[PDB]
């Protein structure tokens, strides 16, 4: 019941899991992050990434959409995709990495 | 904020077996399979601790944990294997993150059901060969009955 | 013009970029993967992950959808999300990691 | 398969300046800004190499590369600065991946346009202060004109 080291695209996606799971396991439901863990990362971890550490709500609602505070199996994903995209085209249509 | 405050301690280290009559036996700290006990102190001994908010249905809700460690069975999504979570010390005030390990227990005489407070259509079903999961119930035995062991 | 080491959720999403970019930079358009790089990974890198190394087409079409054979800025993402999900709940409703 | 086969070598190491009259100057190996040359051997020297498939429009298409290395300007999307890609050695047979660095050149007397073969609505626009990008054109000067330097 343990994903041992993986192939390369797996290396990239597994890596996404482990960090995620470290927080998902913190509070209730070790398989999903709550509104507090989202807010913690968005506020603390995301100021650099998601320059919208205030109204986490909007994004939360889009992910939460089933009125499920638990950012579970690819409900969270929308943000995760917004994440990998944001790092790239944040405002990089001129310059953002340096 | 609004806290869900612990109501009362029911019974503890007692084991529930379903209409298939299978002791909820400990296979792992995340996976559990139902099988009639033969070592007796072999099944996971649960204890019920009720919490209170006016968001049940018509029945009061308790948390199922192993009397020694705080291993709760949580409700994932439909026919998805129960995830046994382990977190030091039982919470006295329940937030909205632990809404999966909450259980609406409807007792009928001797038999009893375990309804998920997270997703209504979920009920804890019992399999003959597979792990004791949760489900929407077609011919899976989502019945339970509490049978204690001798010692 | 260079993303130097990042914060933690960034560490996880940046990591997704770098691997990706290594292939995206291989052929035409260093910001997108072609149908041949998709096929290479799906065939070579994905047999373990995406147990459908044959008809890459279906997934390709879903990503390609604009008849843009360039797996670019979060057109690819759909698969990327399917990726991070698949590693977790492949058929993992009984067992898949061991 | 179907190959797009190189048609003919046009002119090389010649620089294009737009109606703003700004030499396409090399700021980086990924970002380029238009500014009137002052070191002359300062702007990126491009060379045109035509390829042929019957998927142009009404005009024959060439690839713009720096005469020394193979740095092509690729057509991204809307108003997003062109990414200068570097790949050792020029391809002789073009597949469906380099459709961004392909250019439908419509020449009118002295002036000329550069249409994206990837996305039709894209045209290579010129900014007074920013990088020479591609665009849909409202008052951006998506005009060009080929002016050579002396030496």
Swiss-Prot record, chains A, C:
Compartments, as annotated in UniProt: Cytoplasm; Secreted
Superkingdom: Eukaryota
Gene3D superfamilies in UniProt: EF-hand (1.10.238.10)
Keyword Transferase: no
CC terms in the record's Gene Ontology section: cytoplasm; cytosol; extracellular region; extracellular space; nucleolus; nucleoplasm; nucleus; perinuclear region of cytoplasm
Subunit relationships: Homodimer. Part of a copper-dependent multiprotein complex containing S100A13, FGF1 and SYT1. Interacts with FGF1 and SYT1. Interacts with IL1A.
Name the record gives this protein: Protein S100-A13
Origin species: Homo sapiens (Human)
From Swiss-Prot, chains B, D:
Entry coiled-coil feature ranges: none
Gene Ontology molecular function terms on file: copper ion binding; cytokine activity; interleukin-1 receptor binding
Any one Gene Ontology BP term: positive regulation of vascular endothelial growth factor production
UniProt modification remark: Acetylated within its nuclear localization sequence, which impacts subcellular localization.
Domain free text: The similarity among the IL-1 precursors suggests that the amino ends of these proteins serve some as yet undefined function.
Known function: Cytokine constitutively present intracellularly in nearly all resting non-hematopoietic cells that plays an important role in inflammation and bridges the innate and adaptive immune systems. After binding to its receptor IL1R1 together with its accessory protein IL1RAP, forms the high affinity interleukin-1 receptor complex. Signaling involves the recruitment of adapter molecules such as MYD88, IRAK1 or IRAK4. In turn, mediates the activation of NF-kappa-B and the three MAPK pathways p38, p42/p44 and JNK pathways.
Protein name, as recorded: Interleukin-1 alpha
Subunit description: Monomer. Interacts with TMED10; the interaction mediates the translocation from the cytoplasm into the ERGIC (endoplasmic reticulum-Golgi intermediate compartment) and thereby secretion. Interacts with IL1R1. Interacts with S100A13; this interaction is the first step in the export of IL1A, followed by direct translocation of this complex across the plasma membrane.
Family: Belongs to the IL-1 family.
Gene Ontology, cellular component aspect: cytosol; extracellular region; extracellular space; nucleus
Localization in the cell: Nucleus; Cytoplasm; Secreted
Keywords: Acetylation, Cytokine, Cytoplasm, Glycoprotein, Inflammatory response, Lipoprotein, Mitogen, Myristate, Nucleus, Phosphoprotein, Pyrogen, Secreted
Residues bearing glycans: 21
Recorded superkingdom: Eukaryota
Chief localisation class: nucleus
């Amino acid at each position: 019941m343990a994903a041992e080291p993986l192939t390369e695209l797996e290396e990239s996606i597994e890596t996404v899991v482990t960090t995620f799971f470290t927080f998902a396991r913190q509070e209730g439901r070790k398989d999903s992050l709550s509104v507090n863990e989202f807010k913690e990362l968005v506020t603390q971890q995301l100021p650099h990434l998601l320059k919208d550490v205030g109204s986490l709500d909007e994004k939360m609602k889009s992910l939460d959409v089933n009125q499920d505070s638990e950012l579970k199996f690819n409900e969270y994903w929308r943000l995760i995709g917004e994440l990998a995209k944001e790092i790239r085209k944040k405002k990089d249509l001129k310059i953002r990495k340096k | 904020n609004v806290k869900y405050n612990f109501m009362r301690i029911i019974k503890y280290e007692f084991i529930l077996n379903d209409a298939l009559n299978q002791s909820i036996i400990r296979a792992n700290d995340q996976y559990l399979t139902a099988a009639a006990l033969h070592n007796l102190d072999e099944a996971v001994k649960f204890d019920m601790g009720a919490y209170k908010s006016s968001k049940d249905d018509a029945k009061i809700t308790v948390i199922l944990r192993i009397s020694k460690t705080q291993l709760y069975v949580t409700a994932q999504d439909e026919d998805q294997p129960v995830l046994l979570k382990e977190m030091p010390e039982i919470p006295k005030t329940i937030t909205g993150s632990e809404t999966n390990l909450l259980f609406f227990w409807e007792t009928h005489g001797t038999k009893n059901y375990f309804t998920s407070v997270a997703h209504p259509n979920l009920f804890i079903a019992t399999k003959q060969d597979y792990w004791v999961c949760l489900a929407g119930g077609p011919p899976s035995i989502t019945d339970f009955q509490i049978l204690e062991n001798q010692a």
